[PDB]
Structures are given as structure tokens and as C-alpha cells.
A paper describes a structure:
Here, using recombinant baculoviruses, human wild-type and A331P ACTC were expressed in Sf21 insect cells and purified via gelsolin affinity chromatography. We therefore carried out cryo-EM single particle analysis of human wild-type and A331P ACTC filaments to directly resolve potential molecular aberrations in the surface strand that may account for the elevated diastolic contractile activity. Both wild-type and mutant F-actins exhibited similar overall features in cryo-EM micrographs, consistent with the mutation preserving filament formation function. Using the helical processing workflow in RELION, we resolved actin structure and connectivity in wild-type and A331P filaments at up to 3.5 Å resolution, enabling us to build atomic models of the complexes. Overall, both structures were very similar, exhibiting an alpha carbon root-mean-square deviation (RMSD) of 0.536 Å between the two. Direct comparison of the atomic models of residues 320–335 from wild-type and mutant ACTCs surprisingly illustrated that the backbones of their surface strands were nearly superimposable. Thus, cryo-EM reconstruction alone did not resolve major differences in the orientation of the ACTC 320–334 strand or in its individual constituent amino acids’ positions. Therefore, to investigate potential A331P-induced changes in protein dynamics, as well as possible structural alterations not readily resolved in our F-actin reconstructions, we performed MD simulations of wild-type and A331P ACTCs using models derived directly from our cryo-EM-based maps. Thus, our F-actin MD results suggest that wild-type subunits, and importantly regions of the 320–334 surface strand, appear to exhibit greater mobility than the A331P mutant.
Myocardial force production is derived from cyclical interactions between myosin-containing thick and actin-containing thin filaments. Thin filament-based regulation relies on troponin-tropomyosin (Tn-Tpm) complexes that span the length of filamentous actin (F-actin). During diastole, the inhibitory subunit of Ca2+-free Tn (i.e., TnI) binds to F-actin, and constrains Tpm to the B-state where it physically blocks and limits myosin attachment. While the association of Tpm with F-actin is highly dependent upon electrostatic bonds, both short-range van der Waals (vdW) and hydrophobic forces also contribute to the total interaction energy.
Author numbering:
A (entry chain D), B (entry chain A), C (entry chain E): 4 to 373, 376 to 377
The structure:
Amino acid sequence: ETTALVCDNGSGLVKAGFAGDDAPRAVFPSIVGRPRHQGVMVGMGQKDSYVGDEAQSKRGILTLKYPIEHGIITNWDDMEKIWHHTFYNELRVAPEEHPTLLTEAPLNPKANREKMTQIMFETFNVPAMYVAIQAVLSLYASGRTTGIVLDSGDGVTHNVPIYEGYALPHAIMRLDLAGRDLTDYLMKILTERGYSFVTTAEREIVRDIKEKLCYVALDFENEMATAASSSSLEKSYELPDGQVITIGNERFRCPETLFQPSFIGMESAGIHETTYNSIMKCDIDIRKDLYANNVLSGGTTMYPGIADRMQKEITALAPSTMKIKIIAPPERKYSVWIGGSILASLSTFQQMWISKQEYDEAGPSIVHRKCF
Amino acid sequence: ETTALVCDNGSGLVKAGFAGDDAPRAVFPSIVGRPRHQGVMVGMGQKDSYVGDEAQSKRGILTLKYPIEHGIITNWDDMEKIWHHTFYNELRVAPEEHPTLLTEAPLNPKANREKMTQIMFETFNVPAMYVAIQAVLSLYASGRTTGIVLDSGDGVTHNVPIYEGYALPHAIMRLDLAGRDLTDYLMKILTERGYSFVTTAEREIVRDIKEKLCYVALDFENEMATAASSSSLEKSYELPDGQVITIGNERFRCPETLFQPSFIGMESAGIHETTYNSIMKCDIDIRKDLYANNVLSGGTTMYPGIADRMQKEITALAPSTMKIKIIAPPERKYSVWIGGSILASLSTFQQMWISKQEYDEAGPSIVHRKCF
Amino acid sequence: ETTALVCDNGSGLVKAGFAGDDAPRAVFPSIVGRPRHQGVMVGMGQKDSYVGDEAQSKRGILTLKYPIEHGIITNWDDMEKIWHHTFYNELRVAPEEHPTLLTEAPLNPKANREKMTQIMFETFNVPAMYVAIQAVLSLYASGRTTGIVLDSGDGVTHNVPIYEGYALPHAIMRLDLAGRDLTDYLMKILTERGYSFVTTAEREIVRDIKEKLCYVALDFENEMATAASSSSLEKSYELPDGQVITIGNERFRCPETLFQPSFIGMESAGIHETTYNSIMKCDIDIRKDLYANNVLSGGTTMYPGIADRMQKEITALAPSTMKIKIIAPPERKYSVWIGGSILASLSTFQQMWISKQEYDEAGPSIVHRKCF
Ligand SMILES: Nc1ncnc2c1ncn2[C@@H]1O[C@H](COP(=O)(O)OP(=O)(O)O)[C@@H](O)[C@H]1O
Ligand SMILES: Nc1ncnc2c1ncn2[C@@H]1O[C@H](COP(=O)(O)OP(=O)(O)O)[C@@H](O)[C@H]1O
Ligand SMILES: Nc1ncnc2c1ncn2[C@@H]1O[C@H](COP(=O)(O)OP(=O)(O)O)[C@@H](O)[C@H]1O
Ligand SMILES: [Mg+2]
Ligand SMILES: [Mg+2]
Ligand SMILES: [Mg+2]
């Protein structure tokens, strides 16, 4: 088919569309909800479960459950239902007349890819498919060849150093600190002021609060000293019922745990330290082009002032002679999808799909020896 | 053809050009590298190998390999690739419409010259060719007729005593100490300060450090005593990644192993003793002109103060009545190519080529009987 | 004193004892852990740090840090604490009334030895001391005089060719691939099955499973083909919490990085190839005894079937006429300590110590001129 489906499936969001476009047409949260109450009324549609915005609208009754956890798929029936919703009820295109493109984080269990390709070749009967790393697709979107990518989505944060068309597999780091931990920490620290949120429906509200009211502080101690005279930092948010919530230092305390994982109990290095270490694991004469090309991807990298603090933190480690620049495109959120769409439409790539006949003979193990 | 090709082919560098000029136009390292990594990106030219500066600029990915070792050519396909790069992509001239001149170190395996002739007559279809010793060409460059030449390049160091128009083949010495062992010894003793270099790419960095930061000391014990108060000898170098490396007595410890091969494990004599022994092997009535005419050639002899120490070392052995003079032209590096260009353009030499029809009947054995 | 301490200090383990014995009485891991948590309870022992087994038993709380990295001591205070624990709280012997013997890998920074002497002479006030290479001590333990020793410990692997009482310093090779890289690679490849270990307390568990469940395969591709029908290779291990972990081809995949360093990205040759190159670096008339005397030392050389593969690989390189034998004593781990104890008790060696009055005049620089 001339147009191929590219369906990026992250840990928190589902973004799908067609190859060759610029922005996806189908974007929605990747949750599945089920009723947990009596259901006295008769004659109303007794749907077993709701997926996507249909569940986000009635979360008040349901019990939302994310099928993807830290990139790992736990419940596969929910994943099949979500894929069905993307293919039929959201994109209105049959899957057996188009090839599909998939994304999956590096350093992941091998059974995940085999089960993904088995599902897509059995329950959907697609003609071809291909799985690609998020970081290489994000680099494809930026129209570059050398540099490192810090992809920070909802479940995993990882780095992939890429030189002029070549990848270094030994320098690929991966830490399991992501947006879900940020939301959990915000929920935990919001009880100091008195506001308590427990259920998944309230977890969605806390995530919404984090999305549009939190910023990264360039300096932490100075900002804390400024917030000590709590006059110019407190904002307000509106609850669905009508109550007003005010927060102070939690605007910058919550996003700082990326740079200081010790706050949430993890013993590890911050994102700046991880990317510096990933730089240092490469050769010596290719470190300059990595320093000069720092690409920010993912949805968690949209906090205001993140780049201005990352530059200072990395400069504090790198030698003074080198110059440091981080790339902050205005379209961080859909960079992986844009790169996948660009790769799918390329005329060179169309000979590296996985045809149905090849899987019929090589079996599900074809992904490991044909995709990476 | 009025203008003949002269492509001097040393063990470390390739310098090619046109007969009749003063300096070669094509000079570049003689290395061939190959990728060793994944190659995940598509659409970028997947070249199998890179030759010359194209590989020197990307050494960070490849694994560089010198095809010529101690003057002995081990891999012939790499040599064919090197010659192809010299002729087509760097000199922009056809090889089948020009005659070529080649150089090789004396006391060499007989297979090398016949293989070179066969390759040049089969894969390139040259009309004529000729092979000559480096030392005699270096003598030609200086415009002299009597004297000895110490050629010290990258793989071999040798001597050729020459009286008026005649050569003494029994007095030709050859020791296998050259620049490569110098870089290896510098790498070995550079670990004392903590800096460790292992791979080939770092070997090039160490070679660059040696080329512009090492000098020959007139006295060794006095210089070591001076460096004991390590204040006035330390310098600094800038690594590609930005780190600063400082070295002390390693500036003069490394170049001395030419005068003292016992440091690097070999139980032989130094270059001064080698040239003195080569002088003494000739007749008695021709020694004075040899003492008065000492010609220094090659790239290894570019260390500052080498002539001042060689003069003292040779004088300490020779009888006090005789006078010692060593010539150190500002253009040691390209003396062999200059002499080759001078000889090629000479009208007398135009009868000592090797015609293609001569090779068609004599076979590859014509070189041994028509070149030396 | 009649009895002298021989306190061997490797990069992963500390083994100390008394001269004249057969096995050391003091063996413990060389780690220093510090608390990282609140410490709400009052009245309990608030020790700043724990050393040795006292920290190995409470790793669940602490953050262990190795003071020695690749033979180089980075943090000197931790080394002082470890030596204090070794002398007082584990051996119960005052250090000022006994002489001590130390070991250190070759081709090491010069500051290391002099700082070690300075520590031992200022902050312990020992009467005399001496440092020695591990390989020569391992040869001493075996009761031989000619042969090469491949010492493979935790941080460094090195070779020392030894003829009849003489050492060839130009043939000493050293690669930085050792057990720590083995553990890191095992951690990296253990995540394919789903199990992920990140913390140092989990690094200890990974080292433990590596120690007693991994073996070296004689043939790699045949073993992979056998493991394809994964029935007869899988084993089971018990993590402390209670779960079960089972692995397949990881039993032999990780050991093999000694022979194929390209798996971990390093551009070097295998240990067999480094040993062969070190053999070929010597003279021609001494290679026979080196071939006929191969001594294995270190703790990394205890993988089952290592000798059966090393002998095959070495025979595949050496000429067929020569016979190859490899010594695999049942006491590889403590061979260095045994050799040190043997040498310390020797009567001839008694005149080669470093007296305190000599250090008071010559200074810390006496080690370089009186030890090697
Ligand atoms: N404007 C924003 N400000 C702060 N955080 C955001 C914003 N938009 C999204 N996020 C965070 O990004 C996460 C979603 O990342 P996502 O784009 O789904 O990555 P992926 O598609 O790779 O899973 C959410 O958990 C949310 O907390
Ligand atoms: N300026 C310099 N100072 C010191 N050594 C040099 C310098 N330039 C070149 N060399 C040494 O000379 C070697 C190259 O010699 P080269 O001119 O290629 O001889 P040939 O052409 O006969 O091979 C290099 O290995 C390098 O170590
Ligand atoms: N039984 C065993 N099997 C496999 N590996 C082992 C075994 N015992 C120890 N090791 C390895 O040896 C290393 C320790 O070496 P060690 O004896 O400390 O050398 P050194 O004392 O010279 O530092 C550890 O990293 C461990 O992985
Ligand atoms: Mg993403
Ligand atoms: Mg030369
Ligand atoms: Mg050891």
C-alpha cells in the first residue's frame, strides 16, 4: 500500500495515523475502564468496558487500568482491545490492507516483540510490520545524523548515542524514572497542605494539575528561599466539583526529582548525569559532536525551563573548552511519530518490512534477526 | 608522456605528484578503515571502507589498519585500494597514459618488487615503470655525488654509502627501528602518569602528540637531572574531548631510543653506531668524503636538536683529526620525492624504463635484472 | 620479626595473613558502605560506616563502593579504613612490630606505589615493607622458574613472561577486561528474560549468581545450537526474598567475553590472543619452555572448562609441532598469597626490605629504585 500505518504506542498515550502526514489524527490516553457498581437501570447500553476518551469522560464510575507498565505489557487482552479501538473505531481503516509501524523502548524483554508480532500477524492479518527504537525515530524527525537523544515519556527514560549513521549499543542507558513516578510523588507531597487524592480518577486530576501548573526551577535552593516568602509563587486550580486548590513550592519541587532521584527513594543518578555518562562511554574523538547535538524528546521534557537548567548542569561537568547546546523543538511531544512517518514513506526502507510469508516460515523469532 | 608520475610509497605516508615540480600535490596517511558497528540508520551511504583523510576524520568509528608493515606489504587488496585512491580520487589523472616511478627500501624480499610490477601492469595497464632506492633519490635531491644517507621513515631505517657515481652494496645496513616503535614506546611509558591509550584511534592521537611535543636532548643524564626539578620542561596538550594532558621527561625520553635501542628490548646498536659501522665497512681512501658528507633524510629525523647530538656522538667515535659535517636541510620530509622528480625528468634516465612489451616477454622477473 | 604479614590487596578481595602458613586467615570483600536513610531510632549504634562482612550483611541499607578500580586506588581514606580493619579488627596484630608485604599489578601509575609507602610509613609506622608483582609471586607459589602466568582477578589481567630467573619487561601485556566487566555484562544481558538489577545490593546478587552458576563452553556455536532446544541447560537460583530466577544460554554467554571482547564493545583481542602475542614478543630460543609452561592464576580463571577451551584456542594458533600444556592448580584463588608467603619467609629475601631509616633519607621515591 502507498500509505502505511504508523501507530506509536507509548506507556501512557496512543498516537496513530498515516505515513506522510505531519501530525497524528488519533491521539488518546491508553486506559481501559470497567464498571464497579450495581447498575440498577435497565434498557441502557450495558457495555462491558470503555476505552479512550469514552472512559476518560466517565472515569467517575469506572476503575481505569493502564495495560502498559514501564514499557512492559502486562495484560495482553487490554492491549488487543486498545489496538482494535485504534484501528476500527478511531481511524476507520482495515488493518489487512496496510502495513504497520511500531515503536518499543530499548533494553526490553525479548518476549514482548515476539508476542507483538504474533498478535499483529494472527488477530489482525496485516501484510507487513516493523518495530523501531524511539530514539532513532526521534533523530529521524529532527533531520540529523549525529547526536544523543534523551527520550522521556511516561514509563521509561533512555538514551541512544548515534554517530554518522552508526549506533553504539554499549552506551545505551535506561532508567525507570518517568512521568508516572512524578505524578505519584506529587500525590504524596500534596497531602502536606491537606489535599488528599487516592483513587485512579483523582490520579488523573493530579496528572492534569502537574501538566499545566508545574515548572522546572533553574536553581533549587534560591527558589526555595524565594518561596519561603510565599507571596509571588502560589497559584490556583479548579476541581471538577468546584473546590479551589492552591499550591506553593510544589510547582518546582515535583519536577526536580528528575535531577535528584533520592527524593523518591531511588538510588541512582539524575537525567543530566545519565546523559553525561552515556556520552563518556563512547570513544574520545566523537564526544564533541555529541556535546554539540543534544536532542530532547518525549512528553516529560515539556516542563518550562528544563533546557536552561540542563545546560548549566551539564556544563558544570563537561570541560570548560567544549560548548554545550541542547535542542528544544516546539514539537517535542510528537517527535517520535513524525520520525516514524518520515521513515515509513522513505523509498529505501520499503525493502526491510517483514512479509507474511517470511513469518510463515521463520516463525515469531523473525523479529530478533530482522529488526535489530 | 612528457610529465611522468612519481608516487613515493613509504610505510606510513603516501606522497604522489608530477615529475618536474618542487613539492607533491597529494599527501595523506596510508590507512584503510572499516566499520565495526550496527549501522541502524538507512538512506545514508553505506560505504564498505574509507581511505585517507576520509577515514582519518571518522577514525572514531572505524578500526584503522596499515597495509605496509616495516616496508613489507602484507595485504595487497588494501594496497590496490590505496593506489586507486591516489590515482583517481586524489590526483585526477589516468594511469594508463602516464609512466610511474616507485620507491622501496633496500634489502627487501624479492617477491615485493615482482608483485608490485605485476599489479601495476595488470590492474592499471601503465606503459612503463621503474623502481628505485630511497637513499639514492635523497642523494639526487641534494645535488651531490658522494656521501652516505640515513633514511629514517615510518617502518625502516637504512644506509647507502655512495662514492662518485658508484654504490657499495656490501656496506648497506638496515635496522628495523622507525617511527612506529617510537609511538609504541611513547604509549607504553605514557601510562606512568596515568594516561592510557589502547585503540588505534588513540594511537593516532599519541602520534600527533609525538610529532609536535618531543625533542632530542643533547645530553641525557644532565637533562634528567634538570627535569628532576620538574618546573621548566612540562608542557600541555589538548585532547579532542577537551581534557588536558601534561608530560615532563617523556618529551626527551621517547626520541632517545633511536640512540639507545636497549630501552625497547632490542639488543642492538643505535643509529649513530649503525652509520659509523656502515662508514667503516667501506675502503680507507674514500672515508674522508663520507665523513664530510652526511645527509639526513626521512620524517623521523625532524626532532629538534637531532643533528647537534648526532655530531657529538659521531665525533666521539671518529679519530680527532678528521672533521664531521651533517646536512640537515629544512626539507627532510619530502627529499625522497624531490629526488624522484629530479631523476624522472632527467633526459638520460628516459632509456631505463620498463616497456610493456618487455614485460610481455620477460615476465615479472625483468625487475630484478633491469632495476638493480 | 620472625613472622611477617603478607597483606595482598586485590581490586575485589582482601586476603591477609602471616608468613610461613599455607592459607590466609583473613579474607573479606573490599567494600565500604554508608547509610543513606533517616535513622529514626535512638540509642542504637550510629556507626558512620561499615567495612567488610559487617557491610556485606547490611548491604540492604547501605551503598557499597569499591575503593580500588582497575588496580588504581581512587579514594585513599577508604583504603586507610580498610587497612585499619585488616590489621586491628580482623588480624589482631599491631603493625609497628612486624614487616608487611604488598602486591600491585604492573604497568601502573607511579604515584600509587609512593603513596602506598607514604601511608604505611607515616600513619602505621611499620619498620620495613616491600611491594611485588602478582605474576612473579604466582610463579613462586607453583615452585617453577620458567613460564608465563595469566593473572585474571577483578580489575586487571596481565601477563609476565619469565625465563630462568629473569624477567622480560618488554613482553608484559595488560588488558583492563576482568571480573567487574563480566558482572556488568551479565547484568546487561539478564534483562532479556525480564529480570532487572540496578542497585549495588543487587550487583552483589548478580556477582553471586555468576560465581556459582556460569561455565565456559568449549564450543560456542554448537552450544548455542544445543541451547536452542532449551531443555538440558536451564538451571534455577534463589534470590534472598524468595522468588526463583532461571536462565538458559546466559550460563556460557557471559564467560565468553574473556575470549571475544567485541561483545562488550571493546576493540581488543581475547585473553588467549594476548597471551600468544606476549609469547611471540620474546626471543625465539625461549618460546618452547613458555609453550610448555602455562600457569593460570587469579579468581576469574575458576570457570569450569576454561583450560579445555584455552588449550584448543592456543593450539589453533601455535605451530603443530609444538606441544601445549596448561597448568590449572586446584588453588588458583590464593596462589598469589601463597607465593608471597613463600617469598617472605625465604632467608635470601631478608636483605631486600626497605628500612625506615632509608626512607627517612631517600624519601618516598625509594620504592621505584629499590623495588623494581
Ligand atoms: N505540557 C506538559 N507538561 C508537563 N508534563 C507533560 C505535558 N504533557 C505531557 N506531560 C507528561 O508526559 C507524559 C506522557 O508522555 P507521552 O507523550 O505519552 O510519551 P510516550 O508517547 O512515549 O508514552 C504524561 O505522563 C505527562 O505527565
Ligand atoms: N614534525 C615531526 N616531528 C617528529 N616526527 C615526525 C614529524 N613528522 C613526521 N614524523 C614521523 O615520521 C613518520 C612518517 O615518516 P614518512 O615521512 O612517512 O617516511 P616515509 O615517507 O619514508 O614513510 C611518522 O610516523 C612520524 O612519527
Ligand atoms: N568460583 C568462582 N567462579 C567464577 N568466578 C569467580 C569464582 N570465585 C571468584 N570469582 C571471580 O573472581 C573475582 C575476584 O578475584 P580476586 O580473587 O579478588 O582477585 P584479586 O585477589 O587479584 O583481586 C570476582 O569478581 C569473582 O567474579
Ligand atoms: Mg515518547
Ligand atoms: Mg622516507
Ligand atoms: Mg589476583
